[PDB]
């Protein structure tokens, strides 16, 4: 029965992420029209001023998709270009004042998702959460 | 830490299905060059002779993607067209003798995937599998 439940559970995630890149539980409270990745790019740029290369490394997406998402992001006056004193085809990205609340929302939407996972876990005792933790460790390794 | 582990586990599935539609664990033993969905279409057609509409319902994919996959499937002499005595734009699909071992492989790769899930579950006792089952029930409902 557990074999069929694991197949069912993984199947539900498949349907849920047929067009999404990341899993975010709840609804997006952003007033601006931006995709999952686009809003996340603003989130990582808020904490640290990142280059075109680091965005691809953090998001785990292709640099071709990065330039495609960054061009639509700078179009809506959300991100601004910057270049170092020792240029080695280096393009640093900075966050504008227009993007600051959007990045704040996504960071809150990520902690909102984790808090819902925390609740589901808190239904079980410390010794029960260990059994779940051990399972999710073995299962996650099949997808690595 | 469980909230972070759930976020990590779901993330590993995200990376796994970035180009996949269904989760199959193990390498594909098929000698013919066909995609995940293409080899799954042959599997469902082997047991029951399905119409162009039921394929979209079973696979949970758009009928536009169905015709795109069915045209490449009939090209390699794997599937054959059929029409009823009372035609109401009905296009029934039948499996050829060339496709029979391919559908058999896929069905065995799905049982190979379930058997690996069975193993991971069998590591835990009957009372421990209940704790996991209760968790996966509550978690799967967030993606429904
Ligand atoms: Zn995000
Ligand atoms: Zn958001
Ligand atoms: Zn399949
Ligand atoms: Zn196969």
Numbering used by the authors:
A (entry chain A), B (entry chain B): 2 to 145
Quote the study on this structure.
In this study, we have characterized ZitRMG, a metallo-regulator of the MarR superfamily. In L. lactis subspecies cremoris strain MG1363, we have showed that ZitR repressor controls an emergency response to Zn(II) starvation, allowing Zn(II) uptake under extreme conditions, while impeding it in a wide concentration range, from repletion to toxicity. In solution, ZitRMG has been shown to be a stable dimer able to bind, as expected, both Zn(II) and double-stranded DNA fragments bearing the palindromic TTAACYRGTTAA recognition sequence. ZitRMG protein is folded as a triangular-shaped homo-dimer with a two-fold pseudo-symmetric axis, a typical topology for a MarR superfamily member.
The structure of ZitRMG holo-form was first determined at low resolution by single anomalous wavelength dispersion (SAD) and then, after crystal improvement by molecular replacement, at 2.8 Å resolution. The asymmetric unit (ASU) contained 8 ZitRMG molecules, and 16 Zn(II) atoms. ZitRMG molecules formed four dimers (AB, CD, EF and GH), all binding four Zn(II) atoms in total (two per protomer). In AB, both protomers have almost the same conformation and superimpose to each other with all 1144 atoms-RMSD of 0.34 Å. Each protomer is arranged from the N- to the C-terminus as follows: α1 (residues 3–17), α2 (residues 37–48), α3 (residues 53–60), α4 (residues 64–77), β1 (residues 80–83), β2 (residues 93–96), α5 (residues 100–124) and α6 (residues 127–144), in good agreement with our above-mentioned CD results, and as expected for a typical MarR superfamily member. In ZitRMG dimerization interface, the N-terminal α1 helix (protomer A), which is stacking between α5'-α6' helices, interacts with α1’, its counterpart in protomer B, and the same holds true for the C-terminal α6 and α6' helices. In ZitRMG like in E. coli MarR, streptococcal AdcR proteins and ZitRIL, the DNA-binding domain is folded as a wHTH domain made of a helix region (formed by α2, α3 and α4 helices) and a β strand region (β1 and β2 strands). The two metal binding sites of ZitRMG protein, like those of ZitRIL and AdcRSpne, are located at opposite sides of the dimer and two Zn(II) ions are bound per protomer. Glu23ZitR, His41ZitR and His111ZitR are moderately exposed, while His107ZitR is buried. Zn(II) is clearly coordinated by Oε1-Glu23ZitR, Nδ1-His41ZitR, Nε2-His107ZitR and Nε2-His111ZitR, although a supplementary coordination involving a second atom of the first ligand (Oε2) has also been proposed in AdcRSpne (see below). The three Zn(II) ligands in ZitRMG site 2: SH-Cys29ZitR, Oε1-Glu40ZitR (a buried residue), and Oε1-Glu106ZitR, are the same as in ZitRIL and AdcRSpne. Interestingly, ZitRMG is shown here to better align to the DNA-bound form of any MarR protein than to its DNA-free counterpart, suggesting that holo-ZitRMG dimer could be folded in a DNA-binding prone conformation.
